[PDB]
């Protein structure tokens, strides 16, 4: 199949560290010719070694056999770190590439599976295909060198016990198959006339409800004792054909031992053939045994790794984000404006927004009013364009975000809430964030001063420097809070949009959060995710999205004369 | 510890079975000497047989291998065969006892189990338990018979090479335990810190809704290079530790055998050592490695095993049904009085019952109305004593049930309902299930007439005796109802509990139903769970039980009068 055409697209991968492959090759290759070597060492060991007197041969072939495990080890180490070594670089370019590929995918792409499972792909997927492949390798090249080897050590010594080996090995074999085979089907067919068996005592049981209401526990009683008796005749009959098997298999490969003696019993191939020249031939035939099995499952493991590899290779190309827009867009200054506009989640057929009409005027904050699931949320998600909207237009400053750059627009927005991203990095490179080549250590300074973020800072074990993050100093949920209120404080982003939190916190840790928030962050145009009555009370108009739908708009106080589903909400609060 | 003491508590059970037991062992005992003579044949094969001429051993060997193997396939049958035979007959015994006692448990027990798992546990659990012993009998004789034979056989043929390995072979195996062991903790340790570079990538993905919003996507590649990096160096150290363990365990193998070749060099037991009689020896520290690890894994295999049949045996010997009364109740003539009676039905805390009080007048019906879940079947469950009341008293004739014998209670009530059991069996010893010996098939005929029940009993195969079972010729709901209705005017049972079916069947079925209930099945004390409207009305005391408690009591007109909860049913109905 197109399995083997997978190497031919990973080349491009490996072939730049052909020494690291040529080197194991050849480590492997000297490592087959040491173990057929020692294979070959038996000969002398008996005709010329054992025998007679220890002429010097039973003094120095042990020195053989050390030396050549020494080989062996020194040639095993070798091929097998350079193995590792071009796998961990085929697995380090391929993560890097799957890595930078997965960074630019639209949001969806994490919606439609948690990102545990995504780890696990650039994580034990690389490594999963990369280990087949080289275990294809490392058993093809190894395995293939010690059959010559061994083939080449059978022909030399005494080819004429050989060249009847290779005829007769595989007849035999097939042999042992048909015979398997044939009592193999027997089996399967006791076992569906078991199942039937075992059914009905099933359904005895089930009559229990109805056995003790009748005067049955007697007759009950005889019938399973006819059950049992079926059951165990049948468990007879599968074991004796099991039993009746194997030593089928068993005299037909002696019956094909006692053929290869007697064939080197005639007067035509004894002349070659000596006491210690045999014990080279048939040891090889027990040790080629391993590798030819190898070999089979060797197209086996290629297959599933480089079907996994498949897989690796269909998320590495795929769709992205759609950054079709030009024009760029610097310190937004104009309207924020929903016109019409309707879109349905990904997921639901059921729409999330639906004809939602909003404006977040300049300089000025709205609320946003609704339940849990109200869509509430998902309005500043298209704020963000995370999601793209179906039908309508959201425009700032007067033109429709789909025509803008992505990179542009998401520099103009700027999330502070209570569920904020820490990296594992120093805190001013987290407040100054992916721009920490633009602004100063004063600036971020000041920026933590002015958010009342630096009382926490001021004590930490190096200030301003200090690794942080959630695999190391862990900050509370104020703190956190507080780090992202400086980030969006220092970037100044024009457009702001808050999640207020649903629980309150500590009266030092909330009365500095809601000073930052209320008197410094909030200055700019804000869509507030409002859940403290008091928040919406100080807001400038008051919008209530209801599961897709605005109901009413308009201020605290009008929203109130009004009597609408704002007045009995804030009556709730 | 006590899982030995599992065998003795078995002797009972195996030991009258002795000699298939004792013949299997025969049988083991000379396959192991038919494998050590197999063994030792190598010496006149290379000494006396292929060297010099082949002076008749070459034509001779032959044929004792032939023979050899012949025995050890008659051998292997024998022994097997008869431990199946004494495996089986055990499975037998120990299900036909557990069965024996399942059917006197409480139907408490039926509850706390799905029929399922009862029949794995009568099925496959015995199964286990014995191919485990016999597994483990059939190792321990085989193998150990096996190694004596290849100590023997190496201590007669050479013993100074054999008082060598013996020595040095063990040693070896300590030694490279240790190796192994201590680079094994190696690899733990490189595990740990592999988890937490492993966390960090998982970090850094869920970072990704916090890297589009700012300028990121460049310091994001540059910190999963540095992880990247540490990865690849990780399972290079990985990969260096496995590859350093493999060559010294080989190594140390190789420095045995050389240290082997080194003593035998001396000329002190060359003298009875040759080239033949080597062949024998070696081969047997070759073959004796595997029978060794069948021994340590004996008891591990006979532990698991034998726990099994403890919880075997914890399911043979438990409670059974409290039948400790002694009066026993013909023709019951009286009334059904429930006083007070609180229960509750086990697995649930809340109370099912509460001070349930119920009269059911002899010769009388009374209707049970209430809805699902509301305990109107737990009525009828404790008037069969299924389960006993925590307080109160429920009488028949006069006496409570606790002071009754159940067979002779549990023959005074026939139930009838849409969920009816059909045994495997002939149709009239369905009729006149338990009870065959006492009715003629005139009896059986008749009542199968009179329940409206033969139109569908002469139009089978066989008619009166057609085999019928649900694994087996399959009735239909109505069909089932009136064989039932047949069993229950055939043993004229004076109490009777109906449950009306939910749903309507077919005119003509629904007709006959209904006209045996009616006219010839209720007319004696019935209970009633009532699902009709119409089958309400025509009783002699409407009963409505919800939550333990009943609404009203009366009859239909009176409690439309009394506009209770029965007469808003009504209404709905």
Redesign the interface.
Known sequence: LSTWQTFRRLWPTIAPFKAGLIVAGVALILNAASDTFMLSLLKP???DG??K??RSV??W???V??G???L???T??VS??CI??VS??V??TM??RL??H???MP?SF?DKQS??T??SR??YDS?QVASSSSGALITVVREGASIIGLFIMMFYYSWQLSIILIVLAPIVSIAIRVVSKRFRNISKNMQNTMG?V????????????????????????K???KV??R??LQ??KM??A???S???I??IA??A???V??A??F?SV?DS????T??VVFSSMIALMRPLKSLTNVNAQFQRGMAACQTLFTILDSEQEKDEGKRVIERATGDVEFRNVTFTYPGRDVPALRNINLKIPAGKTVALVGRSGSGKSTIASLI?RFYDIDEGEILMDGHDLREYT??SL??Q???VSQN??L??DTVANNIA???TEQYSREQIEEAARMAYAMDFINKMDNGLDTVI???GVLLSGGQRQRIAIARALL?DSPILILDEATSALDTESERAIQAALDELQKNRTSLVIAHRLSTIEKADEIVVVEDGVIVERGTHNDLLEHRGVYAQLHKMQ
Chains 1, 2 share one sequence.
């Open positions: 060991l008996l005709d054992f025998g007197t220890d039973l003094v072939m042990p020195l056999v050390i050549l495990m020494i062996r080890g020194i095993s180490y097998s770190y590792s070594w961990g670089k697995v380090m993560r890097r890595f930078g997965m960074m630019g949001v994490f990102t545990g995504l780890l650039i994580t490594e039937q075992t059914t009905s005592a099933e359904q005895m049981l089930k009559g229990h409800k109805e056995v003790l209401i009748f005067g049955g526990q007697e007759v009950e009683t019938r399973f004792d049992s008796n059951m165990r468990g007879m074991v004796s099991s039993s009746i194997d030593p089928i068993q005299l002696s019956l031992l006692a053929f003696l007697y080197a019993s007067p004894m053939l000596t006491a210690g045999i014990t963000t992505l990179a998401r520099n927005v700027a999330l904020v991203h990296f594992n964030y992916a721009r993050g959630e695999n970037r």
